Amino acid sequence: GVAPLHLGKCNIAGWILGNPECETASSWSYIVETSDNGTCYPGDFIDYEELREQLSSVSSFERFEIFPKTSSWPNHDSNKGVTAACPHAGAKSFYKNLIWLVKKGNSYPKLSKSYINDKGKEVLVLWGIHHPSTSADQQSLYQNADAYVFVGSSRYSKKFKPEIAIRPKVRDQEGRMNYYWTLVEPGDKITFEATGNLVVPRYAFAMERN
C-alpha cells in the first residue's frame, strides 16, 4: 500500500551503514536496489541476509542519534576514524551512522556506554569490529594488544576479539571490518564495553516491521 524505497546506486548495507556516497521515508512496501557502493571498508556483514528481510517492509522508520558524537566519547579520539576506502567528495571519510574510535594520546581507556530504548518501538542498532593487519597497527590505533569488545542486551550477548593478519589488499586495505546488528526491545538496555577495535554506533533506527 506504500511506494517503494529506491536506493539508487547503493545496496542496503551501504545505505543503512551510511556510506557517504549514499546521501528518506518512514514507510515502504519494498526496496529497490543495485552491487557496488555497499561496505566501502572491506569485511563481512554478519547475518546480512536477515537484515534485508527485516528491512524489506516497514511502516515506521526514524533515524536518530543514539550516541551524540561530541558528547559520548570524552576519553577517546572520535575524529581520526576516517579512511580513503570510504571517501566523501574527494576527502577521506566514513559511515555516517558509525564512529571509528581511536586512542587519545597514547592510551585507550576502557569504554563503557549504555542506551535504554525510550522509543515506543523496536530500535535497530549497528556497529563494527575492526581487524588490523599487523600487531603494530593494533597498538598505533588502539594501544592495547589484549583488546576486547563486549555488547550486551536482554536478547544479544557477544564478546569480540581482533584477529590480526595480512589479508589481500581490497580498496588498498589489508585490514578488515566486520559489521553487526541487533534489535533492541522497547524496554531494553544495550551496553557497550571496549578496550579497542570497536566501531561505535552513532545513528540507529526506530522502526516497525510489516
Epitope: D77, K80, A84, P87, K92, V102, S133, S140, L141, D172
Partner: antibody, heavy 124, light 109 residues
Framework: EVQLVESGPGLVKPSDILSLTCAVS?????????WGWIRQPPGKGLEWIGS???????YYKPSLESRLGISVDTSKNQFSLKLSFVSAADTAVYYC?????????????????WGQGTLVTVSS | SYVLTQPPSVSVAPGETARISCGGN??????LHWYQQTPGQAPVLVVY???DRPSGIPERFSGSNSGNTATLTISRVEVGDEADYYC???????????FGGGTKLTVLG
C-alpha cells in the same frame, strides 16, 4: 635523545654497490617503528628510498626496487642500505630516518628523527 | 607513482602570513606531513597527520587538508623561518613515501 648516524664510502664507481649503515643510539630498533632512507641530490629535492621493520618487512620505492636491499641488525642496533649497479643519478646526500606510523587508520608513515646525512658521489 | 606538486617559491614580509600549497589528485584522501629544511641541515618535521604539531614546534606552524590543495600555513613569519619546505604523503596503492618538489621561503625587508 634518539640519534642516527650514517656511514659508508663517499665515493663509488658506476656499476658497483653503494653500501651504507645507520647506527642508532638511545633507542632500540626492535620497537614500534620502521627505519629507512631518504636521499637528496645536491641542490635538488628529497626522494624517499625505502624502509624496514625489525621483523624484516620492507617497503621499497618501485622505481628502485630491482636495485635495492635493506637489512637490520638488532644486536648492534643498526640497519643498512644496499643499492646496486649505481650511476651518477645516485649521487646524493643519504639520510636515515625513523618512520612513525600515522595515528590515522590507513597505512601512512612519517619521519620524525633524522640523521645529519652522508654524501655519496658516484663517479669514475 | 603518486605525484605531489608545490610552488617553487613564496616571499613574505616579516610578521605577515606565508601559505604553501601541496597539490595531488584526491590529496584529501591521504594524510599529509610537512618538513622544514634550513641551509646546511637535515630536514625537521613541522606538521604530521595533516594538522598535528610535533612537540617544540611553534604554534605559528599549522597544516590543513581541506579544499583540494593541502596547505602549510606560517603565521607571523620571522627571518629565522627562511628554508625549503617539503610536503609528503604515503601512497597506499603502491607502498611508498612521496615528497613534493619543495618550496623556498624568502623573508623580505
Amino acid at each position: 635523545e634518539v640519534q642516527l648516524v650514517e656511514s659508508g664510502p663517499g665515493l663509488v664507481k658506476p656499476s658497483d654497490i653503494l653500501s651504507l649503515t645507520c647506527a642508532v643510539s638511545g633507542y632500540s630498533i626492535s620497537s614500534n617503528y620502521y627505519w629507512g632512507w631518504i636521499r637528496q641530490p645536491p641542490g635538488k629535492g628529497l626522494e624517499w628510498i625505502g624502509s624496514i621493520y625489525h621483523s624484516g618487512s620492507t617497503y621499497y620505492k618501485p622505481s628502485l626496487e630491482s636495485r635495492l636491499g635493506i637489512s637490520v641488525d638488532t644486536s648492534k642496533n643498526q640497519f643498512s642500505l644496499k643499492l646496486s649497479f649505481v650511476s651518477a643519478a645516485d649521487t646524493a646526500v643519504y639520510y636515515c630516518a625513523r618512520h612513525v606510523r600515522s595515528g590515522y587508520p590507513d597505512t601512512a608513515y612519517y619521519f620524525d628523527k633524522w640523521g645529519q646525512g652522508t654524501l655519496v658521489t658516484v663517479s669514475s | 607513482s603518486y605525484v605531489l606538486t608545490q610552488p617553487p617559491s613564496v616571499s613574505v614580509a616579516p610578521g605577515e602570513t606565508a601559505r604553501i600549497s601541496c597539490g595531488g589528485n584526491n590529496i584529501g584522501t591521504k594524510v599529509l606531513h610537512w618538513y622544514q629544511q634550513t641551509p646546511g641541515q637535515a630536514p625537521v618535521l613541522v606538521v604530521y597527520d595533516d594538522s598535528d604539531r610535533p612537540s617544540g614546534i611553534p604554534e605559528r606552524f599549522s597544516g590543513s587538508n581541506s579544499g583540494n590543495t593541502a596547505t602549510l600555513t606560517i603565521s607571523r613569519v620571522e627571518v629565522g623561518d627562511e628554508a625549503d619546505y617539503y610536503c609528503q604523503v604515503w601512497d597506499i596503492s603502491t607502498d611508498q613515501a612521496v615528497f613534493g618538489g619543495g618550496t623556498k621561503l624568502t623573508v623580505l625587508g
